[PDB]
Ligand SMILES: *C/C=C(C)/C=C/C=C(C)/C=C/C1=C(C)CCCC1(C)C
Ligand SMILES: *C/C=C(C)/C=C/C=C(C)/C=C/C1=C(C)CCCC1(C)C
Ligand SMILES: *C/C=C(C)/C=C/C=C(C)/C=C/C1=C(C)CCCC1(C)C
Ligand SMILES: CCCCCCCCCCCCCC
């Protein structure tokens with residue numbers, strides 16, 4: 136079950152890599168090339184992640200459980216690129232882009248600490264990591280969206296959809312974590328693997344396609 | 359004593375985070391937003407550092423002593439942001455900004471090597487790290503200051519003060535290190551903790567306020 | 582033999598650092614200052630690498646062999662600066678520069694995995710790392726060169742030479758790796774050390790001088 140879902144991750148991400156890579160090579164202009172290149176590397180990184188986990192790398196027994204700590208290594212590299220999908224389309228300001236990137240990095244590092252420390256101290260870091268996540272939620276839902284809407288007055292719904300899908304998908308990660316054996320142990324590592332793999336596929340391949348469609352919608356509103 | 363000073367660090371940095379965070383949310387324009395955001399993340403990172411150390415994380419017995427090696431992890435992230443305070447206010451050129459950032463990173467990595475290696479080889483890395491620090495001192499005191507002064511002809515003293523406080527504070531770190539049990543063992547880990555915590559508070563919260571006042575002085579000289 | 586070649590590395594890189602550092606301090610304009618600063622840090626990083634290896638740091642017994650894994654730490658920092666030599670001279674676009682940097686980082690991380698895993702699984706990562714290298718080869722030999730040539734119509738041969746020397750030197754690294762005890766064991770660690778040291782000196786000090794001469798050639802074609 137765990138192995139099966141890791142190999143689904145390998146294949147889904149490698150497929151996503153292939154599509155965005157071809158997309159980058161055939162891109163119309165620099166803006167399409169930028170957005171395809173972003174999503175190509177997001178999926179390539181995740182494909183390497185899933186390859187490593189499937190082959191038994193980046194996993195050690197922590198708190199009595201085999202723990203796939205390597206997810207934080209690759210998430211640290213791929214999730215800023217996802218946030219750059221948003222700020223590239225929104226044409227977000229410099230300080231707001233750095234705030235998104237900074238908050239995200241803080242979230243992952245303190246989430247990594249939560250994952251490798253024993254209970255109950257791990258809950259302290261979980262709370263700190265969630266607080267950094269809540270900052271991201273506020274930044275995307277208010278200043279990022281408002282500015283993006285002012286700059287794309289005809290496409291306001293496009294950005295509302297982008298942020299909605301983003302926060303729906305990302306919010307499920309700490310829910311999976313807290314319900315997993317890291318917290319309340321309401322399901323097994325096998326199901327935990329399934330949930331993170333579903334989320335990763337939706338938030339990288341799925342969201343990657345949404346970002347491309349969002350750019351088409353932005354172009355069509357100024358044709 | 360060590361625990362007391364670590365908790366003073368937690369509180370001081372978390373307070374500093376709160377002030378700059380509010381400052382960033384209320385900032386007048388993009389320039390104030392940039393500088394508050396820089397100082398917010400400097401203090402937030404240090405608050406995470408002190409939280410981790412206070413809870414017994416990032417410390418292992420090295421050379422027979424409990425050693426808070428995690429300081430190098432977070433210093434690596436927060437001190438480039440401090441240097442960006444200076445180059446943002448000075449409007450420093452691209453190569454000079456990279457030189458400051460590069461020299462700083464080199465200083466911390468070789469300082470980390472000095473801290474985890476045994477004597478006398480540790481002294482070799484201490485000397486290399488100090489050499490990288492001396493490059494920073496020269497870069498700030500001569501090309502950074504001279505260029506900054508040419509661009510702010512009415513505020514030359516503002517930058518002289520910025521650089522003076524910076525180099526006074528940063529020079530005390532290798533002095534603390536060499537006098538600590540890492541070198542001549544003239545004081546205990548408890549006092550060592552006190553000195554690094556005082557320095558960190560002065561060079562992050564204190565210097566952060568100075569940087570904000572420096573920007574006000576720069577604005578007032580062109581009103 | 583291993584120690585001798587590590588000390589040759591220390592000296593060659595430290596010499597290279599000194600020349601580019603002086604060059605940066607005396608640079609004519611910002612463009613010369615940028616290119617000297619790039620090459621100064623490339624050589625300074627490699628000098629720290631060779632100092633650490635010569636003193637017995639960054640080497641652990643992996644797969645029954647002492648293995649200088651630290652090379653990947655410093656290569657990760659210095660090789661993007663080499664690629665920036667190329668994109669600075671070519672005035673390469675943003676997505677193409679990120680693609681070069683991204684592919685390079687992927688190459689080194691999966692190459693690091695190949696180096697620390699046992700056979701035959703290490704061959705899987707070797708193949709993945711080479712695939713990332715082949716992407717670099719294609720990106721430099723086609724889109725990077727073509728764009729660079731369109732922007733420097735009078736200096737097309739300069740860029741052809743730059744890319745040729747680059748790919749000749751970089752291709753020798755995976756050949757050394759696969760023929761070393763990491764692969765077919767056709768030569769000893771002593772010779773392996775000699776080859777990586779020769780390559781590092783050619784691809785950093787040597788290529789650094791080529792990059793400077795290339796800039797002179799670019800300037801002379803518009804005098
Ligand atoms: C491609 C990978 C993605 C989008 C991963 C996203 C991960 C998160 C939003 C992580 C969230 C967490 C917290 C907010 C608290 C602590 C536990 C984490 C790391 C799962
Ligand atoms: C917020 C943290 C700050 C400003 C830390 C600054 C640290 C230094 C300037 C470190 C200096 C060192 C050397 C110059 C030599 C080796 C020992 C160090 C790392 C303490
Ligand atoms: C200054 C250091 C340089 C230019 C190092 C370059 C290293 C490489 C091009 C590494 C290549 C490798 C592969 C393509 C496959 C796996 C083995 C490596 C890491 C040697
Ligand atoms: C920058 C792209 C990296 C993607 C590949 C991630 C693979 C990491 C595997 C680490 C395993 C180390 C086990 C000892």
Ligand SMILES: CCCCCCCCCCCCCC
Nearest residue numbers: 230233234237240395396399
């Ligand atoms: C020229 C300087 C611009 C700075 C913009 C503010 C962005 C701050 C990013 C903080 C990220 C660090 C978190 C680890």
Ligand SMILES: CCCCCCCCCCCCCC
Nearest residue numbers: 241244403406407410415416
């Ligand atoms: C990017 C912001 C990071 C700030 C938090 C630093 C906490 C690091 C703790 C590491 C502890 C690991 C112990 C095993």
Ligand SMILES: CCCCCCCCCCCCCC
Nearest residue numbers: 453456457460463618619622
């Ligand atoms: C477009 C390229 C600009 C490069 C500017 C020079 C900055 C060099 C920074 C070196 C930092 C690396 C040290 C680890």
Ligand SMILES: CCCCCCCCCCCCCC
Nearest residue numbers: 464467626629630633638639
């Ligand atoms: C950013 C510049 C770094 C260059 C110096 C590299 C030295 C690394 C040595 C690491 C040794 C750790 C052994 C425990």
Ligand SMILES: CCCCCCCCCCCCCC
Nearest residue numbers: 172173176676679680683686
């Ligand atoms: C580890 C690999 C990540 C590097 C990917 C770089 C992508 C570059 C595309 C340009 C993005 C521009 C955003 C404003």
Ligand SMILES: [Cl-]
Nearest residue numbers: 181209210213
């Ligand atoms: Cl990932």
Ligand SMILES: [Cl-]
Nearest residue numbers: 194195196197
């Ligand atoms: Cl284990």
Ligand SMILES: [Cl-]
Nearest residue numbers: 404432433436
């Ligand atoms: Cl810090």
Ligand SMILES: [Cl-]
Nearest residue numbers: 417418419420
């Ligand atoms: Cl220990």
Ligand SMILES: [Cl-]
Nearest residue numbers: 627655656659
């Ligand atoms: Cl190197």
Ligand SMILES: [Cl-]
Nearest residue numbers: 640641642643
């Ligand atoms: Cl060992």
